[PDB]
């Protein structure tokens, strides 16, 4: 198995640093820490990336990331939970959504749940004896439940603490047959407090975009991402909170279905701006620059064409499509997206 110990080391250091850091009103997860989280989830997936032929889902659900049968033999899972004589597992066992007040608690709880295949209620996403089931009624619903609980749990914290910007996404494989509009309306129609402009703004932005742009756009797809067989399509600009939230990388397989220009932002630069790679033609868009370190790495795409609904153009505005590293200045809607700062940026090609 391909086990990237580097992201386990970085994750451990992040939790040590932030364990007793109180979540205040504007507290957010830094670029470095977001990239560590992102790496951890992707490395977890890569260690045991496919189901076994004798134990697979006839619905095509990716059980290798959803069941104890696979996760307990995933060497990345095992190495992470055993790291430092199991000290993160010891801390993890003290946590639940209702008592979390600190950054490191929040990150450890959300991420260890995901890379253990556990809901916040402690149930596994899917049961082992259900791997081979063709009953879509409970297979699809279990995954909707798991996806919604990742996001709603975080909104429950944000509302209790009155925090604006903490955010970890539900990774792309947990959207198996999940309707984004229903997720959004289910959660927001049921809790008026989540609508407060000072509560859960990146969670809101992530779910809102997914409520208006479905996973598979068929003939309207302009872009397609694939990581370990999990695909996703887009026809708008793709903000960093989407790529970070879903666990996609600008180094994954990216296919263009139109001749529209895209600006693929990949790293911060040394003049307070960002460096991007431009692609134009149909076909595979391959970033061949070195992968930036966690301090500097960005994942974001601005799509340029003449047919985007005016109400959706703001997703590509510079200071919305990339998450501000100064927490209080993060943008999350058309009412505060701005498009200044381009002087500081550079086309790499």
């Amino acid at each position: 198995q391909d086990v990237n110990v580097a992201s386990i080391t970085a994750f451990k250091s992040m939790i040590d640093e932030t364990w007793d850091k109180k979540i205040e009103a504007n507290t957010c997860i830094s670029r470095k820490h977001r990239n560590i989280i992102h790496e951890v989830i992707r490395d977890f997936m890569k260690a045991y990336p496919k189901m076994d032929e004798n134990k697979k889902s006839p619905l095509g659900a990716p059980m290798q990331w959803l069941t104890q049968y696979y996760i307990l033999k995933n060497e990345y899972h095992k190495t992470m939970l055993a790291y430092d004589n199991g000290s993160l597992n010891t801390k993890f066992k003290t946590l639940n959504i209702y008592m979390i007040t600190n950054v490191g608690q929040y990150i450890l709880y959300i991420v260890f749940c995901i890379i253990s295949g556990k809901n916040h209620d402690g149930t596994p996403y899917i049961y082992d004896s259900e791997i081979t089931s063709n009953d879509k009624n409970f297979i699809n619903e279990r995954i909707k439940y798991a996806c919604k609980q990742i996001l709603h749990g975080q909104l429950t914290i944000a509302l209790r603490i009155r925090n604006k910007f903490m955010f970890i996404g539900s990774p792309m494989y947990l959207w198996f047959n999940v309707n984004g509009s229903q997720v959004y309306h289910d959660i927001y129609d049921r809790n008026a407090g989540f609508h407060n402009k000072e509560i859960g703004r990146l969670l809101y932005a992530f779910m809102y975009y997914l409520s208006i742009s479905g996973r598979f756009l068929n003939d309207f797809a302009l872009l397609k991402f694939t990581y370990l067989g999990e695909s996703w399509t887009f026809s708008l600009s793709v903000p960093e909170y989407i790529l970070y939230g879903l666990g996609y990388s600008v180094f994954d397989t990216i296919e263009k279905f139109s001749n529209d220009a895209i600006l693929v932002y990949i790293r911060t630069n040394n003049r307070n701006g960002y460096d991007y790679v431009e692609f134009n033609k149909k076909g595979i868009a391959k970033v061949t620059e070195d992968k930036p370190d966690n301090d500097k790495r960005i994942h974001a795409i601005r799509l340029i064409n003449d047919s985007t609904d005016v109400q959706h153009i703001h997703f590509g505005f510079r200071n919305m499509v990339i998450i501000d590293n100064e927490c209080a200045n993060i943008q999350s809607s058309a009412e505060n997206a701005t498009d200044t700062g381009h002087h500081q940026d550079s086309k790499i090609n």
């Epitope: 596994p124 619903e141 609980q149 959660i187």
Partner: antibody
Framework: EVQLVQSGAEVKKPGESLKISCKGS????????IGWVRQMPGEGLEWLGI????????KYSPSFQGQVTISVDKSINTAYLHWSSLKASDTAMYFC???????????????????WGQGTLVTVSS | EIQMTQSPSTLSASVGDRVTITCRAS??????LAWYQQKPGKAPKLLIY???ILESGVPSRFSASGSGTEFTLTISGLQPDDFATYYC?????????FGQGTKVEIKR
């Protein structure tokens, strides 16, 4: 107050069709799922499937898919369980029960509600 | 849904006894477990939901606890109308499979 009233005992032959009913009163009928569960003589309980009366969305256990139909008549607050062709192995007591519209949400799961229906005994013999 | 194992199948007890019925699963059901009582020819009656919460109207001699993989229903002082069959039921499902049942009978 809340009652689920089921139709009377049935005595049928294999191959005959049958429709039994569950009448819900004293609550919002269109916004609670109705589930059907059976208990064969001397056995435990086994679910057949459920229906949401507001829009008639149905979810069948794979054991019963294609062999029964569940339906509703909203005008009389009635849910139905139908066979086009009974088997002798369908001899059992049939219960109905109701469940909240969101039987799960992002915070957890919700149980089937009391009271259940009183039960309809179906006897299938040649 | 997942297989549950309910035990014992028959519990022989007396009025006034503290009796315990157990339900186990190989993976966690969290709190999503109910307990039912059933008497001959009658519909099951809900006693407990969310693994430990008494259904409204159920007498306080009934209680229950859960760890996720092990669940216990305790009747703290059996009374003359508690002889019946009891079922656990998982309900983190659109259906929710029942345990095999426990008959509580009069000991002599």
């Amino acid at each position: 107050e809340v009652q689920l009233v089921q139709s009377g005992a049935e005595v049928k032959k294999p191959g005959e069709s049958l429709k039994i009913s569950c009448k819900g009163s004293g609550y919002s009928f269109t916004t609670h799922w109705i589930g059907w569960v059976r208990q064969m003589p001397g056995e435990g309980l086994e679910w057949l499937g459920i229906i949401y009366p507001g829009d008639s969305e149905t979810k069948y256990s794979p054991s019963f898919q294609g062999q029964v139909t569940i339906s509703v008549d909203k005008s009389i607050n009635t849910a139905y369980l139908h066979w086009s062709s009974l088997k002798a192995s369908d001899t059992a007591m049939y219960f109905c029960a109701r469940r909240p519209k969101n039987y799960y949400d992002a915070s957890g799961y919700y149980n089937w509600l009391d009271p259940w229906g009183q039960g309809t005994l179906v006897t299938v013999s040649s | 849904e997942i297989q549950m194992t309910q035990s014992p199948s028959t519990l022989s007890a007396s009025v006034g006894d503290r009796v315990t019925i157990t339900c186990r699963a190989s993976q966690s059901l969290s709190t999503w477990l109910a307990w039912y009582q059933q008497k001959p020819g009658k519909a099951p009656k809900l006693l407990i939901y969310k693994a430990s919460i008494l259904e409204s109207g159920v007498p306080s001699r009934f209680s229950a606890s859960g760890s996720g993989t092990e669940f216990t229903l305790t009747i703290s002082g059996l009374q003359p109308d508690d002889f019946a069959t009891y079922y656990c039921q998982q309900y983190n499902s659109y259906l929710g499979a029942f345990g095999q049942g426990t008959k509580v009978e009069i000991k002599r």
